[PDB]
Amino acid sequence: SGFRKMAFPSGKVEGCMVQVTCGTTTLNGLWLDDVVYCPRHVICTSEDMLNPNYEDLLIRKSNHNFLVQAGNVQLRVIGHSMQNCVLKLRVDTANPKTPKYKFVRIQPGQTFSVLACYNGSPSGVYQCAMRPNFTIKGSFLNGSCGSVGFNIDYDCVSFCYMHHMELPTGVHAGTDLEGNFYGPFVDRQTAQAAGTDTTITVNVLAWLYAAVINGDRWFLNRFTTTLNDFNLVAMKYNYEPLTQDHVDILGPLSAQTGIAVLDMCASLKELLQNGMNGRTILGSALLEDEFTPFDVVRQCSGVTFQ
Amino acid sequence: SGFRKMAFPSGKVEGCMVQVTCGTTTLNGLWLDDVVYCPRHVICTSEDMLNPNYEDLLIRKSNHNFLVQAGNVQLRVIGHSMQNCVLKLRVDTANPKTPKYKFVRIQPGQTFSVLACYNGSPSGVYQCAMRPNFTIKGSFLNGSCGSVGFNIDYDCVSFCYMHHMELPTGVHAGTDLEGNFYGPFVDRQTAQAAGTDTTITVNVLAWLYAAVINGDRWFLNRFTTTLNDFNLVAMKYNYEPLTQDHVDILGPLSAQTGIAVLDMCASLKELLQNGMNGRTILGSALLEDEFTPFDVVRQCSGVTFQ
Structure with a gap:
């Protein structure tokens, strides 16, 4: 584990x-x-x-x-x-090493791996998420432009991101592989406001499940809550509104741990309103939002590719 | 950045x-x-x-x-x-895809990438550190055994770790590629105590420099300190003793930021004795110890491989 x-x-x-x-x-x-x-x-x-x-x-x-x-x-x-x-x-020559591939435009909250490159040579790899305001918090020095982000489904590479620029505020912006920017950004050196960002609620819930699966259980409480009442606390703390579609995606994780989704919400509420007390969950002193529910299941079941 | x-x-x-x-x-x-x-x-x-x-x-x-x-x-x-x-x-057949390679036995505090594998197929990649007690905090389901850890120097892969077991306490242990265990562990399903672990002080200092380089500066204080007096606070908080060899390795980072090493120590002291106040450094609410000084420089200067 x-x-x-x-x-x-x-x-x-x-x-x-x-x-x-x-x-x-x-x-x-x-x-x-x-x-x-x-x-x-x-x-x-x-x-x-x-x-x-x-x-x-x-x-x-x-x-x-x-x-x-x-x-x-x-x-x-x-x-x-x-x-x-x-x-x-x-x-003139077709790349002998072309994998099977798709171009995909992802949604906010989704995650992907980034291969940071300089002068056409790979330097390192890491996982990041498309923020709700369509920026990414990456690691991109001068000359990293054109580095790509991607997911892999067994044999098939789904390219979803190409890096274009660092905003004055230090965060990063780019396009899909059709060249359309994620977000309101343009390839012009000017002041460009990213909107207000928020926390990807359904990701945080997926990470609390992963915590339960791995022994970390101190945040589990006896209370419960409703979807609408949880949403009122979400917007107090700049969290995305939880929808029924999000409850459904958390379905399998709910079934493997035996903790219903709204019970996990009531745990999250009390973390939001009272903090972490100087404790940790899965090594982190903050609430992590860069794992999707699909990511948690892949890692906790051992899905491979090749 | x-x-x-x-x-x-x-x-x-x-x-x-x-x-x-x-x-x-x-x-x-x-x-x-x-x-x-x-x-x-x-x-x-x-x-x-x-x-x-x-x-x-x-x-x-x-x-x-x-x-x-x-x-x-x-x-x-x-x-x-x-x-x-x-x-x-x-x-009978030599691997056509054999890279140039070395077998290396690493030291505690050093870092390496792990390719988690199941049934001979790669599942994912992540960076981790050899703890002072010779364990690693990884991600290894059943059948991950034989997954390897490695560093890359331009063309050359330095294999340093092979995963063998999960200890009852949930942490992980393994050998170098000569088959000698890191730490006091054996390949036997029994109760095996990892020692007391501590925090890799020189890594934490390297990460505070990376923070200064990237704009995060709220922890910089006017005080200073001595090596021996800093070490007295280190052992209060379960940090490795800082040596002169560690001061020397932090040399280049000292030169690029203009903050002397013992001034950075005095910043660390006050973080240890007063906490973080509910603030963050480089997105983290804890002190991070999984970057070596060499890692920080590689990422902040753009070193490639191929």
Whole structure:
């Protein structure tokens, strides 16, 4: 047993990261079949990012203005298009290491693994969540742009995120692999407000179950509560409203532990109103919201991939 | 910027995990060149683990009693030996995907990535530390035995850990790749006391620097302290004694932030004696000790591998 923030194994995605250079700027791209995907601001210098006209800037460029590297191999570019905020560089050779894959647009609260990359080479892997305000709290130095986030379903990689920028407030924003930003953000160096963020209530509940499964039980109380009365305490503390769909997703976990969902809510209430007392749950002194109910079950049952 | 618990990219190690079966028991093995490495208790049934005579049990076995699987490929076994607590199964075909590699025995306080595996298939990856009492706080369900831990230096994988058992107290123990246990543990299902654990002081200091680098600065105080007086407060709170070697390793971080090491110690003192006040550092309400000084620099400068 034991419980850890685990990322997916990253082999299938390492064989897809390439380096993309256009004039001065270099970042990471994703080579699937015979298309390379990367952030379109690869075509801006530092001054352009103040106020870029992306169509005009791309017109100054031709197929040979794009240097695409995969290890020491160089790919030839023979076609280039702009889909929303992503560049699609049509290359001549299809990636021998292309996995089976989907492009997926995820929902807030969902989690994914990130392969942080620099110069087209993988540096590390970690799990993070799409916040309710469509930002991610990641780890992205200069040149990490074009790093991707992904889930794996046995054989199939579901690419859901490409990193584009660090906001002035230090959090991170990016697109799906169709180039549409998550959230109200744009690829422009300007002041951009992320909204008010809140805590992913259904994730916190999934993590309290994982705690019960692993022996940590001091927070279990005799009280109970109702859905509407729990929601009144949720909004006092900046937690998402719990819906019946959320109660249903927590169904299996409810069945394995024998603790009904609204009983777990009443435990959460008293943690919210009284704190943790200087105690810990699963090694943490805060309420953790970066595990989905599906994550908890995968880790607690031993689901593999390959 | 931002700071995350990052694991190494796990591609190089996925291509090495195989499934090993001997009679009833199945676990994971590590196929490097033409040798498969796995925990020797693969040759015990459930009752044997109470009190196994490993030499006698291995004598009942011959080369064809060992089923080694890599995906759907089967390997032929043509030699088998017991080195301390590991089995070495000599197979006929050399692993085409063998990376450059070393076997390394690490020190307490050092960190490594773990690839949790079931039935020879990777399930997830995470970073953990060798506690001062030679245990690890991991995530290991039944059949995870033989999962390995590793570091990567650019091209080279340094294998340092193989998982063998969960102690009755819920923590985990294992060997280096020469089969010698870290700590006083044995591969026997019995009551085994891990010693008193303590907090890895030099790691906590490295994480406070990472905090300063990333904007989190509320814990910086005007006071200072001495090495011996700080050590007196360390042992009050179950922290490792800080040595000059530890001060030296924190040297570069001292130089990049401009805060001398003993000034950072005086900040830590006041956190230990007064707590965190209900505040956070880098998202955590506790003092984190699972980053080494080398980890902090790798993440804050962007070191890659491939």
